[PDB]
Symmetry: D2
Subunit: 106 residues, 4 copies
């Protein structure tokens, strides 16, 4: 999928997680976020289109996806263990990763 659609998937599933009542809902949403974050790896955003594909700037951009991907990984373990509230808290906390990349690269 394109970067924009992967970002919409992240947005939409964050809201699903916030409103969720049970593990299954949170797991399903985190599963979708994991796939969107991994698929976003290949994208070059408009504001870096004039940089070389493996420039320093592109390395720093992609670092944020490593952080996000790691955070989703941990949140899904918590949800898998039935720690629904803790998985929800983890999802709220990773908004900072979203925000940090947007501040620099959106």
């Amino acid at each position: 999928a394109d970067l924009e659609d992967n970002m919409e998937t992240l947005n939409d599933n964050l809201k699903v997680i916030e409103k969720a009542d049970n593990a299954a809902q949170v797991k399903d949403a985190l599963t979708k976020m994991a796939a969107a974050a991994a698929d976003a790896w290949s994208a070059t955003p408009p504001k870096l289109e004039d940089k070389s594909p493996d420039s320093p700037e592109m390395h720093d951009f992609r670092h944020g996806f490593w952080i996000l991907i790691g955070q989703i990984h941990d949140a899904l373990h918590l949800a898998n263990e039935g720690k629904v509230k803790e998985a929800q808290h983890a999802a709220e906390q990773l908004k900072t990763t979203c925000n940090h990349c947007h501040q620099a690269y959106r």
Copy 2:
């Protein structure tokens, strides 16, 4: 790219890293491995073609990619710091991740 092509990219760049004698070669190779691992996320392996796309078995398959992605992340930091030998050691260590997924799913 398809799973087989991403796997060839991973395999080829691991060999580049082994033979490398400067940071740039190792960084470039790890960069390519990071992209191939992320792109592999969406693939259904032949052995699980008869399972639902977000079955338990497919969750367990994809878990190995989180591990691999994390290991590539750390190796690139070591290479970025000019610790070329230590980045090469990290690359050797992450073969265990490759091997473990292959044993269960190849």
Copy 3:
């Protein structure tokens, strides 16, 4: 050292990182935080003194140190790469981990 001494080390060095001008200052501070976080692992916090040493509650308490330790690890790589502002951002993101444990267990 006891938990309170390790907490003072964490608190003091977070402030050092905020006010730092160069990578060496940030690296030194993160180094100290890494040691304090690892040493804090063995502590029983006052509010869980009435629980068994390896109770579920104590497992959930120690999970926060895994998160903190991992965040310090990554921040030090950023500082080692000379990315002072990015290491400072990572340090600010650490506070969420600090705050979350305090809310639940202090």
Copy 4:
């Protein structure tokens, strides 16, 4: 505890995990390994006794503990999810980390 006691704890519990029949046995063993790895952070290994406690060499030594600690974290999630075999495999994958540090520093 001293480094040798922490190393014996790691070694003993790896063998417990290998022979284990159920999740509880594996979780208990991984719990003990987590504590030993964190406690090992403060130790100076004999072969670096002539280096300053926060020398470059000591930084490189301690990096291996970040790796080990992270791996134990993940293994315990797998055990917590009831994935006994997969937690056992993760414990076996740990040995690469053990071996790497031993080769350079033991």
